[model samples]
Target chain A: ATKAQLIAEVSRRTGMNVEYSQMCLTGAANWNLELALQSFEQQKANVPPEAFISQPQV
Target chain B: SNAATKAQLIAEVSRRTGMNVEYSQMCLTGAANWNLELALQSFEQQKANVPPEAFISQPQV
Candidate 1:
């Protein structure tokens, strides 16, 4: 009946869970999933853990 | 099979996903097929249970 982009599942495929992955993934127009995977997803590795979210940590 | 596992499997996926056009489309095409398949299975279950001829046919006694 409806549709939208998944910031969560695609996020996990990159290695992080949903919450902080959204952090790395948030620039799509942050709407373009394919776009993030192409140019910006390296932030998943290049960035430090501090940039990512930890549910128990921060 | 695993204690109505598919029930929660579908249910929780709904939770894991909230709802938006893209997320719904992703699930619909990708992992969410199970939910619709299960829905069809569940629907046909009772559909098979209630026999149309048994109820409405004129001669069956």
Candidate 2:
């Protein structure tokens, strides 16, 4: 409830899926939306698509 | 038998996660029992918060 709404907001604004939006928001920067959005740009520019995948079973 | 030693562990972790040696160790050592898999799982999460420089092929000093 706490972070899901934030994740939804981030997904809506960033246009990324909930899987990825939640991943970004809960990552190393913790629950910071600003840093999460910035992280999206940085990773998409540098990290591979596979790295961003949130598939649970590989 | 896979990356039994620490150095080789670090080696494989770097290649798998695209992380620098220092950053690799940061996750690897702190994970449960120095498990490379745990560190690998942590990569996407932790990497998102760090500089892209850490994910480069080579560590730039």
Candidate 3:
């Protein structure tokens, strides 16, 4: 394949032992890039809200 | 049953392979399930390789 797909290259490089790399590449191709990034960010959302982190002054 | 808990998944693999539980999870997580039959095949191949230290724990997301 002439296309420079990262996942496909990973598949070829790893000798295709893992299907997930290809599946992730395929998903990236067909799915929305920013949305995927957003979803990943949502799942990995680590920052606490101000209310959760800040102490109220008495 | 109950969406095939890890125990049931191992049971399915066990019924096919006649092996014990710990071997099943190792094969599933490591071998990557090229196919269902291949899954069983790896379990069969690795059955006796399991150490007594094997935890046989259920997989989690």
For model 2, what is the C-alpha lDDT against the true structure?
0.60
> Between the candidate structures 1 and 2, which one is better when assessed by TM-score?
2
Cα lDDT of model 1 by residue, A1-58, tens digit = 1112344444434544445444444555364566655644655457666534434523
- Model 2 sits at an interface RMSD, in angstroms, of 9.4
**Tens digit per residue, CA lDDT, model 2, A1-58:** 7678887776676666676566666424356777667766665554335443343211
DockQ of each: 0.06, 0.03, 0.04
lDDT of 3 by residue, A1-58 (tens): 4323553443343333224333322221222233323322332233123212222221
Candidate 3, A8: how far from true, in Å?
29
Model 1 misses residue B18 by how many Å? 17
DockQ, candidate 2, comes to: 0.03
lDDT of 3: 0.40
Question: lDDT winner among the candidates?
Answer: 2
- Tell me the tens digit of each residue's lDDT in model 2 across B1-38: 33469778778878877777776665554212356676
Candidate 3 or 2, higher TM-score? 2
Model 2 / residue B40 / CA error / Å: 0.5
Top candidate when judged by DockQ against the true structure: 1
| True-vs-predicted CA distance for residue A35, candidate 3, Å | 30
The TM-score values for the models, in the order shown, are 0.36, 0.42, 0.31
